[PDB]
């Protein structure tokens, strides 16, 4: 068996994006008992998607010059809130994780386009890899600010943001960021 | 009475008389392995000391 | 009116009191010179100050002493007189008072100085 942390089942995930399981994978054979395998995917290209996304999380809520070099703390803090989503929604955290990655994942962004002008922006399609990168970045930014200077501890601010982003609820900071991206895509055609 | 008074105060911590062993120069003495030179003489005379650059 | 003392003792008591509890009265200074020992060129300043102290003019201060050496002192026998201490080019005149004990003679030689007075003017804009 290959269950996550030996307690969360991995034979239950359904991405439901027709063909996106090659760019968001927790079932893949690279998915291991723990999300700790040291950094080896960042060297080359399109190898980052071969990462077990649990590792990408435990390294994305791992930032800001106070956490770098403390990866075991990140693995402890992901065990935390994995066993907490195990009880908050009464379901496997991988299901809500794939729901969050399939909804928060942006499609339309706005960028400067042109060789001779600088007046406005143009709508662009954000590829699956960049969309998961910036979605996890928004999730981690919210989870940092939701427990920053606040009495609320980690594994619950992250937990709250994850649950209210996984169901598509717009109350999430990540989902409001997604809506802002979509609306700025509307307003810059 | 300077003949018996000469060299009264032992200046042992200072390198005024223990300066670079080459000439009347200071300001950058290094005692690594007891060189007792400044940077100038060491770098210009490092070929005979045995220190080479292959790093 | 106001009351000043040296923690229950004076120069006379400290002269009578031995160095045993003097070290307990000593803050941290002038103790290890005993263990280290005193060197040469160090026997004339005490004689000179004592000789000056022996004859004190009536209604006049003890005669000025020109000293070029910062001599470490171990006893309060200096207190009660005047000293001409070093400034850098002259000899400045010092009245000794009970603050001398508990402090070193070299701590009365304060000499440090600016260059000149001016403001950021025509030359300096940014």
């Amino acid at each position: 068996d290959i269950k996550l942390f030996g307690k969360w089942s991995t034979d239950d995930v359904q991405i439901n994006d027709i063909s996106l399981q090659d760019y968001i994978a927790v079932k893949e054979k690279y998915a291991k008992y723990l999300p700790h395998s040291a950094g080896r995917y960042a060297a080359k290209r399109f190898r980052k998607a071969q990462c077990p996304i649990v590792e990408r999380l435990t390294n994305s809520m791992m930032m800001h010059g106070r956490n770098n070099g403390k990866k075991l703390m990140t693995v402890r803090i992901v065990k935390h809130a994995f066993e907490i989503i195990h009880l908050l929604t009464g379901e496997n955290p991988l299901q809500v994780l794939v729901n969050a990655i399939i909804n928060s994942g942006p499609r339309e962004d706005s960028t400067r386009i042109g060789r001779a002008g600088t007046v406005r922006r143009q709508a662009v399609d954000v590829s699956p890899l960049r969309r998961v990168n910036q979605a996890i970045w928004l999730l981690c930014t919210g989870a940092r600010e939701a427990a920053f200077r606040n009495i609320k501890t980690i594994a619950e601010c992250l937990a709250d943001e994850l649950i209210n982003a996984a169901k598509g609820s717009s109350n999430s900071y990540a989902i409001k960021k997604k809506d802002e991206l979509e609306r700025v895509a509307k307003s810059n055609r | 009475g300077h003949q018996q008074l000469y060299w009264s105060h032992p200046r042992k911590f200072g390198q005024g008389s223990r300066s670079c062993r080459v000439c009347s120069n200071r300001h950058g003495l290094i005692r690594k392995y007891g060189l007792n030179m400044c940077r100038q003489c060491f770098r210009q005379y490092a070929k005979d000391i045995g220190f080479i650059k292959l790093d | 009116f106001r009351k000043f003392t040296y923690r229950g003792v004076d120069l006379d008591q400290l002269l009578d009191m031995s160095y045993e509890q003097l070290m307990q009265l000593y803050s941290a200074r002038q103790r290890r010179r005993l263990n280290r020992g005193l060197r040469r060129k160090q026997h004339s300043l005490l004689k000179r100050l004592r000789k000056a102290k022996k004859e004190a003019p009536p209604m006049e201060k003890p005669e000025v002493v020109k000293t070029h050496l910062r001599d470490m002192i171990i006893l309060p026998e200096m207190v009660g007189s005047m000293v001409g201490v070093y400034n850098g080019k002259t000899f400045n005149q010092v009245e000794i008072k009970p603050e001398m004990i508990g402090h070193y003679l070299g701590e009365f030689s304060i000499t440090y100085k600016p260059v000149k007075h001016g403001r950021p003017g025509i030359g300096a804009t940014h």
Binding site: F5, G6, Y30, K32, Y33, L34, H36, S37, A38, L72 | - | -
Partner: protein
């Protein structure tokens, strides 16, 4: 018997002495279930239960470790265990199941047999780090 063929990660290494014993795996006087970080135990039980806890049928494996960093020792202690299992399973017993378990753990990951050649580079002067340089003064 010493069929040890290193098993390494960074500057820390492990040597997996293997013999016909009790089936208990020892790490320098302490069981693999209890290691100082108290966090990578699953990383150590991964190989055995991935290939099968039933494989050990009287094999005493003592791994001796030396090097810097605890987590640096791990990924090599388990690599040493996998190497010792490979040596035992290559010395006498068949290869079909050996190739089966090898394919399974190879698709599981790559850091069980072949070492990571990575190592800490030197630092270049004129900066705080090897690649980072000081701030420009305007």
């Amino acid at each position: 018997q010493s069929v040890q063929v290193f098993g390494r990660k960074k500057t820390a290494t492990a040597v997996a002495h293997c013999k016909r014993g009790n089936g208990l795996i020892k790490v320098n006087g302490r069981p693999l279930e209890m290691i100082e970080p108290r966090t990578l135990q699953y990383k150590l039980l991964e190989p055995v239960l991935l290939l099968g806890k039933e494989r050990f049928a009287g094999v005493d494996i003592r791994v001796r470790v030396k090097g810097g960093g605890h987590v640096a020792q791990i990924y090599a202690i388990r690599q040493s265990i996998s190497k010792a299992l490979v040596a035992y399973y290559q010395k006498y017993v068949d290869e079909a199941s050996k190739k089966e378990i090898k394919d399974i753990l190879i698709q599981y990951d790559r850091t069980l047999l072949v070492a990571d050649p990575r190592r800490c580079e030197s630092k270049k002067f004129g900066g705080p780090g090897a690649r980072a340089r000081y701030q420009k003064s305007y």
